Copies of this chain bind each other. A is one copy, B any other.
Amino acid sequence: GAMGSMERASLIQKAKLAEQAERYEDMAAFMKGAVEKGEELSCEERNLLSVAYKNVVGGQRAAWRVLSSIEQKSNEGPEVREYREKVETELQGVCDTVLGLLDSHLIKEAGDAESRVFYLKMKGDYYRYLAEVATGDDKKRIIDSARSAYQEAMDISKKEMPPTNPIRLGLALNFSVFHYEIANSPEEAISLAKTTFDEAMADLHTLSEDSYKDSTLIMQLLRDNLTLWT
């Protein structure tokens, strides 16, 4: 790794600097280097890792959709297809990189619910981004890989976290979107979002003002989707 010679703490520091500078490719490379030091990640470090790659893959997804839309109109020279493929391959590469970090060896060393659910949710997310661009004979297996990861994360979160836990809430949000538009299960999506929202509502009374803010922010995203879906 090109980050093999840099101190773990320096990589984390520079990831935070890169975030401030909106240099998310750099941020992701720094956090990949930190992961490859082999130590477990703290909560803050997990969030740095996720924010970095979410920003990188988000740009790729938005670009892919623009090209995927222009390509569909053109259908209903080879250049549109070629360039959509180029972006698609880059996007798949980022997803494979993240999945590789989770498999070697973040998930297997994650024993606390807050770390293990976080990583399994990420695994679901990056298989979902692969599913968004998948068209071949592996699309069903990619979708089932996303489903499996989300389901394991859900099972742990329901046993080990309160219904307002923001990790649990964000997992349920993303799994519901998976259902709606990847699994073509809109009713499952709506059910999951509603049940998640209502069970969180009923647990808000236990929270401090700060935790209340964190939980209600994600609850509003569930509501946003339910409003579009119903």
Q: Is the pair B63, A10 in contact by a Cβ cutoff of 8 Å? A: no
A→B interface (CB under 8 Å)? 10, 13-14, 17-18, 20-23, 26, 59, 62-63, 66-67, 70, 77, 79-80, 82-83, 86-87
**Mind listing 7 A-B residue pairs with CB under 8 Å?**
A13-B77, A17-B79, A20-B67, A20-B70, A21-B62, A21-B63, A23-B63
Interface SS, A side: helix
Q: Whole-angstrom distance between the alpha carbons of A86 and B14 in the complex? A: 11
Q: Do A10 and B62 form a contact, CB below 8 Å, given A17-B70, A21-B67?
A: no
Chain B residues with Cβ below 8 Å from A83 are 14, 17-18, 26
User: Shortest distance in angstroms between A54's beta carbon and chain B's nearest beta carbon?
Assistant: 17
Chain B residues with Cβ below 8 Å from A67 are 17, 20-21
Chain B residues with Cβ below 8 Å from A18 are 83
User: Shortest distance in angstroms between A34's beta carbon and chain B's nearest beta carbon?
Assistant: 13
Q: Which residue of chain B has its CB nearest to the CB of A63?
A: B21
Q: Whole-angstrom distance between the alpha carbons of A82 and B87 in the complex? A: 31
Additional A-B contact list (13), CB under 8 Å, known A14-B82, A21-B66: A10-B77, A13-B77, A13-B79, A14-B83, A17-B83, A20-B67, A21-B62, A21-B87, A22-B59, A22-B63, A23-B63, A23-B87, A26-B86
Q: Whole-angstrom distance between the alpha carbons of A77 and B11 in the complex? A: 12
Q: Which residue of chain B has its CB nearest to the CB of A20?
A: B66
Q: Whole-angstrom distance between the alpha carbons of A24 and B50 in the complex? A: 24
User: Shortest distance in angstroms between A15's beta carbon and chain B's nearest beta carbon?
Assistant: 10
User: Shortest distance in angstroms between A71's beta carbon and chain B's nearest beta carbon?
Assistant: 9
